[PDB]
């Protein structure tokens, strides 16, 4: 062991962030393409970087979904926090959603095309929310690129998804300040 | 805005103050208790990640014990309270450093010095990382050195005031 000044031994500790699972979201990374932000012991949210689309239309009927009020209220907050943190978002047709039956299905079309890409804004937000192990997802003044064509956000089940990085709440809690920042008037 | 959540953990101790991270809060480790002189710095410092985590775990402990659990997990409370627990500009700093290739704090691993006979402990400081690689101890050895110095200075300030 490391001894400094003869009498002080260097020691370490690692926080088990899963103790916070009942009060705040927990982000973690399963592999390069699959990332998760979990809420509690039952539900959560899978963030996918993929070439395989799941929505071929260009609708995001949030007004309908709100009125019907079948979705998980916490998950919808996270979706809103995610989308409201995207800098300079202006291609509403690059964002497709399906909320039938209360599910969460959100698809950002990253292929709508460096810094002025809508993918830039989306990926930056994805970088910040999966902060723990997002460095293996992708590789210029913060501006990012990816060969993947879609970012998909779908609700998932509580399983052992955190196979590459351990759960952390920092990514979500630090994104909260980016909401309604660098947002355009419409 | 500026954090305000106070840590309350004085029961049964030799002197009020400090904070004990239970086994549940630590990855594969037994309980770790930090004394008042270290933890009391969390009331003043504006840039110690570990202090933000102390308030975070204490809020989680308090909220679970003092509020009744909802049927479906709500994150309303943490959204309401986050800025009284952590300094969102502190992790902005860690984010900007990451963006810049500078070693940064991912809030998971901390180091501290521990006196080999009196057990006195320093306030844990975040073990930095960059592109998935954690710094080696050699990368910040002189930091550990000055920490040992502050420990020695404090131990001498205590023997003086213990008269």
């Amino acid at each position, epitope marked *: 062991t490391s001894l400094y000044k003869g009498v002080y031994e260097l020691q370490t500790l690692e926080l*088990n962030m899963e103790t916070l699972n009942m009060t705040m979201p*927990l982000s973690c990374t399963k592999n390069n393409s699959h990332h998760y932000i*979990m809420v509690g*012991n039952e539900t959560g949210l899978e963030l996918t970087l993929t070439n395989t689309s799941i929505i071929n239309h260009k609708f995001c009927n949030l007004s309908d979904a709100h009125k019907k009020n079948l979705y998980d209220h916490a998950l919808m907050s996270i979706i809103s926090t995610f989308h409201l943190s995207i800098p300079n978002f202006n291609q509403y047709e690059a964002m497709s959603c399906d909320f039938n039956g209360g599910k969460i299905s959100v698809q950002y079309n990253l292929s709508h095309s460096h810094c002025g890409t809508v993918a830039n804004g989306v990926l930056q937000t994805f970088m910040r929310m999966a902060w723990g192990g997002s460095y293996i997802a992708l590789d210029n003044w913060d501006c990012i690129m990816t060969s993947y064509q879609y970012l998909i956000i779908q609700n998932t*089940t*509580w399983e*052992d*998804h*955190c196979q590459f990085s*351990r759960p952390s709440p920092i990514g979500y809690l630090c994104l909260l300040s980016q909401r309604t920042r660098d947002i355009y008037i419409s | 805005g500026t954090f305000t959540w106070t840590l309350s953990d004085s029961e049964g101790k030799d002197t009020p103050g400090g904070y004990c991270l239970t086994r549940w809060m630590l990855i594969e480790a037994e309980l770790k208790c930090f004394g008042n002189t270290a933890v009391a710095k969390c009331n003043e410092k504006h840039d110690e990640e570990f202090c933000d985590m102390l308030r975070l775990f204490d809020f989680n402990k308090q909220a679970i014990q003092r509020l009744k659990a909802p049927a479906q997990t709500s994150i309303q409370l943490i959204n309401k309270a986050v800025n009284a627990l952590i300094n969102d500009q502190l992790c902005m700093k860690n984010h900007l450093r990451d963006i810049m290739g500078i070693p940064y704090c991912n809030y998971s691993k901390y180091w501290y010095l521990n006196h080999t006979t009196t057990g006195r402990t320093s306030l844990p400081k975040c073990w930095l990382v960059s592109n998935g690689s954690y710094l080696n101890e050699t990368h910040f050895s002189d930091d550990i050195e000055q920490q040992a110095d502050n420990m020695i200075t404090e131990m001498l300030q205590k023997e003086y005031m213990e008269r």
Partner: antibody
Amino acid sequence: QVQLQESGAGLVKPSETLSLSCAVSGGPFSGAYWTWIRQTPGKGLEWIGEAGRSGTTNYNPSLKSRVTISLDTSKSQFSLKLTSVTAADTAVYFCGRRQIMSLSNLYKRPVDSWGRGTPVIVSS
Amino acid sequence: EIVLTQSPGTLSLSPGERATLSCRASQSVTKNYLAWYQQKPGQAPTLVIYDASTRASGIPDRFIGSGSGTDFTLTISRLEPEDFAVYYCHQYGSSPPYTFGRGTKLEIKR
């Protein structure tokens, strides 16, 4: 409170494929590793494999890549498929539910709920 | 595989006595992830001990799990009639595959 019930052809001619299924009821089809375990009277209990909804699937090396455990989340039923069946694959086959306790498997728990078991015989 | 050797093969005792069942592991069992199962004939196995020493739901104080590393032990004191079955040793802390012991049959001595 969960209940596992297994079903399928208990009769398999050699050099064919055994196909069994496990119906999960009285609980969500989530948060667990769905496990197959068989018990021969001579050689004891042998762990066959595990399939978790997280995507992880690991088998017993002794089964030499002739075993497959699929999940089918819609019908709430995981399945066991054993190809190239031999005389030694005759046994009682059991359903399993290994509850998952951590997002990172920081803590683990063994299989706690087992099916009734279906006798399976291999003969011409 | 971590082979679990269980001794004895058969243990003959009468109600009220004490049963000491042994399970030795080839390799050290990770995080004491060692479990005990009770199988009565024709029935499926029943969990009675996990984490080497923790009792499961509805398992009376008679059952006591005791062990660490490669040396594990299940002791059933004040033996009741319902306790006689074949008890199995299971480790779940390794990489694939999880293994079982070959069993210890607890029969009644008349």
